[PDB]
Amino acid sequence: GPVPSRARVYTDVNTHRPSEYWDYESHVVEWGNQDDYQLVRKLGRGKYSEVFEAINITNNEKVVVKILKPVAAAKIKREIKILENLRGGPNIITLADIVKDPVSRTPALVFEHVNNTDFKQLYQTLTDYDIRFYMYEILKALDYCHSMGIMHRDVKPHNVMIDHEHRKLRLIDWGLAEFYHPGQEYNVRVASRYFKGPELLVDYQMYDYSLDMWSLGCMLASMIFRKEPFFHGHDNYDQLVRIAKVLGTEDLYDYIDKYNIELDPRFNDILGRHSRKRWERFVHSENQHLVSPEALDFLDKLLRYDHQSRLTAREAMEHPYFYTVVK
Ligand SMILES: CC(C)NC(=O)COc1cccc(-c2nc(Nc3ccc4[nH]ncc4c3)c3ccccc3n2)c1
């Protein structure tokens, strides 16, 4: 059977906290006043929630209200507990309140408002300096949540709200986030197809915080190479083939051999045999201004098949790529 795996960092944070911290099923919700909040306009819908621009009539401040569909299946408590654990962490969306929605009869999460500018207008229009700056701000969020025993599991441009005017970033949508417990097997049906780590795609369940660092590498590659998305799978199988056409099949086989993973036999007809490509093959006249030796070295150390070999968020923040960012 598969060889087990453990994170190389923050392995035992949860084992040493009182059950109060990670036992989200035991958590009792403190309800605020639903009458404090007036919905202004629908902003978005996902498969698990509807999001609204709202006003807090007690202070006239803009808020965002996320009304959970009942389909959450009660995992509302994990999201609430994670949001409360992380509250006030650097670049973590701030949960202001939890009220009972009178219509849905489900919890409505009240968040601070970020005046977001659209990613499809932003992340493919930023400067070299701004890519470095915002990546550093995302790393602060990821090292904070990892240090607090939490993996986000849905890092992608849509879950990063940026107020480009105030140089303000928040990591949002913690509805897939989970507490890391060493030796625990997790559901591989997390993250969005283009950001899914190889561990998910080969059905390796004993994964950890390092899944977020793969997702972040997918975001960086799309930004520096101006290619959305970078790994453009037609489905979850083709997603691994797209990765293997860049990183090569020999390192893929070494990875699944290390963890004693058997590839789905569906791959025998579609994977082929691929060399690792040099990152310079993706450089062209339209994206060269965003590419440096430091950018490629950093990307190279995120986009590794072996989840244990990837930079941690804290190691990533030490990388030369960020030396130019004002701290
Ligand atoms: C034409 C528009 C542009 N196209 C859309 O149809 C969606 O647009 C938006 C715009 C802004 C935010 C969101 C949004 N936010 C979400 N949480 C959220 C939470 C706290 C927040 N503080 N400030 C912003 C914000 C957003 C969200 C969560 C789950 C599912 C979907 C979500 N969606 C969507």
**If you measure from the C-alpha of residue 238 to the centroid of ligand 1, how many angstroms do you get, rounded to a whole number?**
29
246 within 8 A of 277, measured Cβ to Cβ = yes
Structural element, H or E, at residue 164: none
**CA atoms lying within 13 Å on the CB side of residue 147:** 12
**If you measure from the C-alpha of residue 120 to the centroid of ligand 1, how many angstroms do you get, rounded to a whole number?**
14
Structural element, H or E, at residue 281: none
Protein residue with least CA distance to atom 26, ligand 1:
64
Reading the block at residue 209, the tokens are 């915080």
197 within 8 A of 305, measured Cβ to Cβ = no
142 within 8 A of 212, measured Cβ to Cβ = yes
- First vs last C-alpha separation in the chain: 47
Task: Tell whether residue 217 is among the known ligand binding residues.
Answer: no
| Phi–psi pair at 322, nearest 5 degrees | -95, 0
**Best CA proximity match to 206, nearest among 233, 169, 178:** 178
Task: Tell whether residue 48 is among the known ligand binding residues.
Answer: yes
Determine the residue type at 42. K
Task: Tell whether residue 248 is among the known ligand binding residues.
Answer: no
- Which residues does a 6 A CB cutoff place in the pocket of ligand 1? 43-44, 46, 49, 51, 64, 66, 93, 111-114, 116, 118, 161, 172-173
List, in order, residues 6 or more apart from 288 with CB less than 8 Å away: none
Protein residue with least CA distance to atom 11, ligand 1:
43
**If you measure from the C-alpha of residue 52 to the centroid of ligand 1, how many angstroms do you get, rounded to a whole number?**
8
Distance, CA of 20 to CA of 233 (rounded, Å):
40
Q: What are the Cα distances from residue 191, in Å, to 110, 126, 218, 251?
A: 23, 24, 12, 23
DSSP output for 191-214: S-GGG--HHHHTT-----THHHHH
Q: What are the Cα distances from residue 12, in Å, to 147, 182, 184, 192, 237?
A: 10, 7, 12, 28, 33
Decide: helix, strand or coil at residue 280. helix
DSSP output for 45-90: E-SSEEEEEEEETTTTEEEEEEEE-GGGTTTHHHHHHHHHHHTTST
**CA 305 distance to own-chain centroid:** 17
Measured from the Cα of 172, ligand 1's closest atom is 19
Task: Tell whether residue 183 is among the known ligand binding residues.
Answer: no
**If you measure from the C-alpha of residue 108 to the centroid of ligand 1, how many angstroms do you get, rounded to a whole number?**
14
Task: Tell whether residue 136 is among the known ligand binding residues.
Answer: no
Strand partners, 55: 38, 62
**CA 228 distance to own-chain centroid:** 17
DSSP output for 96-156: EEEEE-TTT-SEEEEEE------HHHHTTT--HHHHHHHHHHHHHHHHHHHHTTEE-S--S
Is the link from the previous residue into 229 a cis peptide, with omega within 30 of 0? yes
Protein residue with least CA distance to atom 34, ligand 1:
44
**If you measure from the C-alpha of residue 158 to the centroid of ligand 1, how many angstroms do you get, rounded to a whole number?**
8
Distance, CA of 68 to CA of 275 (rounded, Å):
45
Protein residue with least CA distance to atom 14, ligand 1:
44
Residue 130 zone, left/alpha/beta (φ > 0; ψ -120 to 50; rest): alpha
Residue 178: Cβ-neighbour burial (10 angstroms; 0-12, 13-18, 19+) = buried
Catalytic residue annotation: 154
Protein residue with least CA distance to atom 33, ligand 1:
44
Task: Tell whether residue 226 is among the known ligand binding residues.
Answer: no
Count the neighbouring beta carbons within 10 Å of the beta carbon of residue 214: 24
Resolution (A): 1.6
Structural element, H or E, at residue 316: helix 313-317
49 within 8 A of 68, measured Cβ to Cβ = yes
Distance, CA of 32 to CA of 67 (rounded, Å):
14
Q: What are the Cα distances from residue 312, in Å, to 78, 185, 213, 318?
A: 24, 20, 7, 10
Determine the residue type at 174. W
Measured from the Cα of 63, ligand 1's closest atom is 22
Measured from the Cα of 118, ligand 1's closest atom is 3
**If you measure from the C-alpha of residue 8 to the centroid of ligand 1, how many angstroms do you get, rounded to a whole number?**
34
Structural element, H or E, at residue 42: strand 37-45
Protein residue with least CA distance to atom 4, ligand 1:
44
List, in order, residues 6 or more apart from 297 with CB less than 8 Å away: 319, 320, 321
Structural element, H or E, at residue 222: helix 210-225
Best substitution site from 40, 47, 51 to test ligand 1's pocket, by max atoms within 8 Å of Cβ? 51
